[PDB]
Amino acid sequence: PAILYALLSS
């Protein structure tokens, strides 16, 4: 879940 991970870590 690339898009999700990037959204959760910012």
Next chain:
Amino acid sequence: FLISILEAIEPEVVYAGYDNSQPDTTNYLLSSLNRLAGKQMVSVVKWAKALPGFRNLHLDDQMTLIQYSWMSLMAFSLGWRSYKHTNGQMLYFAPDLIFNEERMQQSAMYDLCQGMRQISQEFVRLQVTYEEFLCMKVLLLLSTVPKDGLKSQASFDEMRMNYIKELRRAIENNSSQNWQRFYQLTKLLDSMHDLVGGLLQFCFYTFVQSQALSVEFPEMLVEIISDQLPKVMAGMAKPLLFHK
């Protein structure tokens, strides 16, 4: 004022970006819902991060929790919206996409729609308050975990208990009456699991044959589902129930 916070971080309404000039085929109806889901996903993520205690958890868990509960969170919020707007007679997916009897039929998932409407009806029967709803919603985010456990297990357990207590606070009244209320509200929470099981089964089925069925899914959902699906089929997740 933990609820004051829950009230402030509650996501603003999300529109589907639905085009009513298009024929409501099963393909268009489901693809539109999937689009709405992608847009709602962004909102649940931004909401989770603002959740007191969620950030204290390992990133891996944060990922896992949202991944396992997004369907339950959205179905539950759908239940609330349908309750406040139509007293549970119709599915208020979004202001621009309300499912009536006709769309439920052409959707090809009438039964799942009724299952979801049933949640809305429970809100009606119980006259669930906005505060009770907010607390319950958080519990949902914390009710489907990996059989093997979370990395911030302790941090997780504390958080869950705090929100459960917050629910009790929301629940004036006498002690026995408050107990009965808690019992009934947690019964509703446990019921989500069976509903979600069915919702997820159709989601995975349409996802697998997406191109062949011409059912579109937004990229964000594709990644989530692609990773989640195998985990669910492998029975890696378990519910945290309140009742036998």
